[PDB]
Amino acid sequence: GSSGSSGLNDLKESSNNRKARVLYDYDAANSTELSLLADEVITVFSVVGMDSDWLMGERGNQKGKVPITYLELLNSGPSSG
């Protein structure tokens, strides 16, 4: 249980997070942590207080701490066309 909670009725997709590809399938030990798979890119973002070796990953309508050592921040810009 406790897999989400509805608040208000508003549609606004305004967020600026980072994206990285997983190098190996990780297994979260606790709730705070999230499970990661191999060859999968998720939304990573740093949160106040959080650690440097851990980012905020969002997968399966869930959020937790993800090990940067397992994530490879894909540093690549778009292709102006």
Short mmCIF file of N, CA and C in Angstrom, two decimals:
data_model
loop_
_atom_site.label_atom_id
_atom_site.label_comp_id
_atom_site.label_asym_id
_atom_site.label_seq_id
_atom_site.Cartn_x
_atom_site.Cartn_y
_atom_site.Cartn_z
N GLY A 1 0.81 -1.21 0.00
CA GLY A 1 0.00 0.00 0.00
C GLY A 1 0.84 1.26 0.00
N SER A 2 0.18 2.41 0.03
CA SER A 2 0.88 3.69 0.03
C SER A 2 1.72 3.85 -1.24
N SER A 3 1.14 3.48 -2.38
CA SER A 3 1.84 3.58 -3.65
C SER A 3 1.34 4.78 -4.45
N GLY A 4 1.16 5.90 -3.76
CA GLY A 4 0.69 7.11 -4.42
C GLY A 4 -0.45 7.77 -3.68
N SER A 5 -0.66 9.06 -3.94
CA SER A 5 -1.72 9.81 -3.28
C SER A 5 -2.17 10.99 -4.14
N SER A 6 -3.44 10.99 -4.52
CA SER A 6 -3.99 12.06 -5.34
C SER A 6 -4.18 13.34 -4.53
N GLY A 7 -3.84 14.47 -5.13
CA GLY A 7 -3.98 15.74 -4.44
C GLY A 7 -5.07 16.61 -5.05
N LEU A 8 -4.72 17.35 -6.09
CA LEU A 8 -5.68 18.23 -6.76
C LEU A 8 -5.83 17.85 -8.23
N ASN A 9 -6.78 18.48 -8.90
CA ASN A 9 -7.03 18.21 -10.32
C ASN A 9 -6.41 19.29 -11.19
N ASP A 10 -5.13 19.12 -11.52
CA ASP A 10 -4.42 20.08 -12.35
C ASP A 10 -3.45 19.37 -13.29
N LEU A 11 -3.36 19.86 -14.52
CA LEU A 11 -2.47 19.27 -15.51
C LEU A 11 -1.36 20.24 -15.89
N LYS A 12 -0.18 20.03 -15.32
CA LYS A 12 0.97 20.89 -15.60
C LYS A 12 2.27 20.11 -15.49
N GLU A 13 2.88 19.81 -16.64
CA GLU A 13 4.13 19.06 -16.67
C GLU A 13 5.33 20.01 -16.68
N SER A 14 5.62 20.60 -15.52
CA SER A 14 6.73 21.53 -15.40
C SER A 14 7.79 20.98 -14.45
N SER A 15 8.83 20.38 -15.01
CA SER A 15 9.91 19.81 -14.21
C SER A 15 11.21 19.75 -15.01
N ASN A 16 12.33 19.97 -14.34
CA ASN A 16 13.64 19.94 -14.98
C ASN A 16 14.58 18.99 -14.26
N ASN A 17 14.49 17.71 -14.59
CA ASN A 17 15.34 16.70 -13.97
C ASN A 17 16.39 16.19 -14.96
N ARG A 18 17.28 15.33 -14.47
CA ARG A 18 18.33 14.77 -15.31
C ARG A 18 18.00 13.34 -15.72
N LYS A 19 18.70 12.84 -16.73
CA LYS A 19 18.49 11.49 -17.23
C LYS A 19 19.81 10.73 -17.35
N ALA A 20 19.82 9.48 -16.91
CA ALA A 20 21.01 8.66 -16.98
C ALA A 20 20.66 7.20 -17.26
N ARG A 21 21.56 6.49 -17.94
CA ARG A 21 21.34 5.09 -18.27
C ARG A 21 22.00 4.18 -17.23
N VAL A 22 21.24 3.20 -16.76
CA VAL A 22 21.75 2.26 -15.76
C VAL A 22 22.75 1.29 -16.38
N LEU A 23 23.84 1.04 -15.67
CA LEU A 23 24.88 0.14 -16.15
C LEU A 23 24.66 -1.28 -15.62
N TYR A 24 23.97 -1.38 -14.49
CA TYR A 24 23.69 -2.67 -13.88
C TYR A 24 22.41 -2.62 -13.05
N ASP A 25 21.67 -3.72 -13.04
CA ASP A 25 20.42 -3.80 -12.29
C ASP A 25 20.68 -3.74 -10.79
N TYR A 26 20.21 -2.67 -10.16
CA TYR A 26 20.40 -2.49 -8.73
C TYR A 26 19.18 -2.97 -7.95
N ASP A 27 19.40 -3.38 -6.70
CA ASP A 27 18.32 -3.86 -5.85
C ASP A 27 18.21 -3.03 -4.58
N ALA A 28 17.21 -2.15 -4.54
CA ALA A 28 17.00 -1.29 -3.38
C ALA A 28 16.88 -2.12 -2.10
N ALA A 29 17.58 -1.68 -1.05
CA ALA A 29 17.55 -2.37 0.23
C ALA A 29 16.36 -1.92 1.07
N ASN A 30 16.05 -0.64 1.00
CA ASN A 30 14.93 -0.08 1.76
C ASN A 30 14.04 0.78 0.87
N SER A 31 12.88 1.16 1.40
CA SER A 31 11.94 1.99 0.65
C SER A 31 12.64 3.18 0.01
N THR A 32 13.26 4.01 0.85
CA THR A 32 13.97 5.19 0.37
C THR A 32 14.71 4.90 -0.93
N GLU A 33 15.28 3.70 -1.02
CA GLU A 33 16.02 3.30 -2.21
C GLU A 33 15.08 2.69 -3.25
N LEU A 34 15.49 2.76 -4.52
CA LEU A 34 14.69 2.21 -5.61
C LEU A 34 15.48 1.18 -6.40
N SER A 35 14.77 0.21 -6.98
CA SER A 35 15.41 -0.84 -7.76
C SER A 35 15.68 -0.37 -9.19
N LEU A 36 16.87 -0.69 -9.69
CA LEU A 36 17.26 -0.29 -11.04
C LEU A 36 17.56 -1.52 -11.90
N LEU A 37 17.37 -1.38 -13.20
CA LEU A 37 17.63 -2.48 -14.13
C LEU A 37 18.78 -2.13 -15.07
N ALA A 38 19.32 -3.15 -15.74
CA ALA A 38 20.42 -2.96 -16.68
C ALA A 38 19.91 -2.49 -18.04
N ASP A 39 20.55 -1.46 -18.58
CA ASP A 39 20.16 -0.92 -19.87
C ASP A 39 18.82 -0.18 -19.78
N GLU A 40 18.66 0.60 -18.72
CA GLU A 40 17.43 1.35 -18.51
C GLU A 40 17.73 2.77 -18.04
N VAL A 41 17.10 3.75 -18.68
CA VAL A 41 17.30 5.15 -18.32
C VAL A 41 16.11 5.69 -17.54
N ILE A 42 16.40 6.31 -16.39
CA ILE A 42 15.36 6.88 -15.55
C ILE A 42 15.63 8.35 -15.25
N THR A 43 14.69 8.99 -14.57
CA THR A 43 14.82 10.40 -14.23
C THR A 43 15.57 10.57 -12.91
N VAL A 44 16.77 11.14 -12.99
CA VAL A 44 17.59 11.36 -11.80
C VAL A 44 17.68 12.85 -11.47
N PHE A 45 17.63 13.16 -10.18
CA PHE A 45 17.71 14.55 -9.72
C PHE A 45 18.24 14.62 -8.29
N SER A 46 19.04 15.65 -8.02
CA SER A 46 19.62 15.83 -6.69
C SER A 46 18.64 16.55 -5.77
N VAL A 47 18.58 16.10 -4.52
CA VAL A 47 17.69 16.69 -3.53
C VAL A 47 18.46 17.18 -2.31
N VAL A 48 18.06 18.34 -1.79
CA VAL A 48 18.71 18.92 -0.62
C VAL A 48 18.97 17.85 0.44
N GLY A 49 20.18 17.88 1.01
CA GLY A 49 20.53 16.92 2.03
C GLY A 49 21.03 15.61 1.45
N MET A 50 20.43 15.19 0.34
CA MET A 50 20.83 13.95 -0.32
C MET A 50 22.35 13.83 -0.38
N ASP A 51 22.82 12.63 -0.71
CA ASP A 51 24.26 12.38 -0.81
C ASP A 51 24.74 12.56 -2.25
N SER A 52 26.05 12.69 -2.42
CA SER A 52 26.64 12.87 -3.74
C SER A 52 26.66 11.56 -4.51
N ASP A 53 26.82 10.46 -3.78
CA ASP A 53 26.86 9.13 -4.39
C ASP A 53 25.45 8.55 -4.51
N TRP A 54 24.45 9.42 -4.45
CA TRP A 54 23.06 8.98 -4.54
C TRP A 54 22.19 10.09 -5.13
N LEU A 55 21.37 9.73 -6.11
CA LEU A 55 20.48 10.70 -6.75
C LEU A 55 19.02 10.29 -6.58
N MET A 56 18.11 11.18 -6.97
CA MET A 56 16.68 10.91 -6.86
C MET A 56 16.15 10.28 -8.15
N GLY A 57 15.96 8.97 -8.13
CA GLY A 57 15.45 8.27 -9.30
C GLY A 57 13.95 8.06 -9.24
N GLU A 58 13.29 8.18 -10.39
CA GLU A 58 11.85 8.00 -10.47
C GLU A 58 11.49 6.89 -11.45
N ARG A 59 10.99 5.78 -10.92
CA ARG A 59 10.61 4.64 -11.75
C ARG A 59 9.35 3.98 -11.22
N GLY A 60 8.58 3.36 -12.12
CA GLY A 60 7.36 2.70 -11.72
C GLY A 60 6.57 3.51 -10.71
N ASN A 61 6.17 4.71 -11.10
CA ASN A 61 5.40 5.59 -10.21
C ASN A 61 5.97 5.56 -8.80
N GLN A 62 7.29 5.45 -8.70
CA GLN A 62 7.96 5.42 -7.41
C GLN A 62 9.21 6.29 -7.41
N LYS A 63 9.66 6.68 -6.23
CA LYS A 63 10.85 7.52 -6.10
C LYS A 63 11.75 7.02 -4.97
N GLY A 64 13.06 7.17 -5.15
CA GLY A 64 14.00 6.73 -4.14
C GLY A 64 15.42 7.17 -4.44
N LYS A 65 16.37 6.64 -3.68
CA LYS A 65 17.78 6.99 -3.87
C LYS A 65 18.46 5.98 -4.78
N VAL A 66 19.14 6.48 -5.81
CA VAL A 66 19.84 5.62 -6.76
C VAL A 66 21.34 5.91 -6.75
N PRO A 67 22.14 4.83 -6.74
CA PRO A 67 23.60 4.94 -6.72
C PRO A 67 24.16 5.46 -8.05
N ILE A 68 24.84 6.60 -7.99
CA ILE A 68 25.42 7.20 -9.18
C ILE A 68 26.42 6.26 -9.84
N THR A 69 27.07 5.43 -9.03
CA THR A 69 28.05 4.48 -9.53
C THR A 69 27.42 3.51 -10.52
N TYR A 70 26.10 3.40 -10.47
CA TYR A 70 25.37 2.50 -11.36
C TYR A 70 24.73 3.27 -12.51
N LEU A 71 24.70 4.60 -12.38
CA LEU A 71 24.11 5.45 -13.40
C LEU A 71 25.19 6.20 -14.17
N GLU A 72 24.99 6.35 -15.48
CA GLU A 72 25.95 7.05 -16.33
C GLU A 72 25.31 8.27 -16.98
N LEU A 73 25.28 9.37 -16.24
CA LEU A 73 24.69 10.61 -16.74
C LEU A 73 25.06 10.83 -18.21
N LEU A 74 24.08 10.63 -19.09
CA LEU A 74 24.29 10.81 -20.52
C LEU A 74 24.44 12.28 -20.87
N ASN A 75 25.68 12.77 -20.87
CA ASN A 75 25.95 14.16 -21.19
C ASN A 75 26.00 14.38 -22.70
N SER A 76 24.85 14.73 -23.28
CA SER A 76 24.76 14.96 -24.71
C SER A 76 23.63 15.94 -25.03
N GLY A 77 23.96 16.96 -25.82
CA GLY A 77 22.97 17.96 -26.19
C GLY A 77 22.16 17.55 -27.41
N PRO A 78 21.06 18.28 -27.67
CA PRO A 78 20.18 18.01 -28.81
C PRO A 78 20.84 18.34 -30.14
N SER A 79 20.13 18.09 -31.23
CA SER A 79 20.64 18.36 -32.57
C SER A 79 19.78 19.39 -33.28
N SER A 80 20.12 20.67 -33.10
CA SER A 80 19.37 21.75 -33.72
C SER A 80 19.11 21.46 -35.20
N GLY A 81 17.85 21.25 -35.54
CA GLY A 81 17.49 20.96 -36.92
C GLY A 81 16.23 21.68 -37.35
#
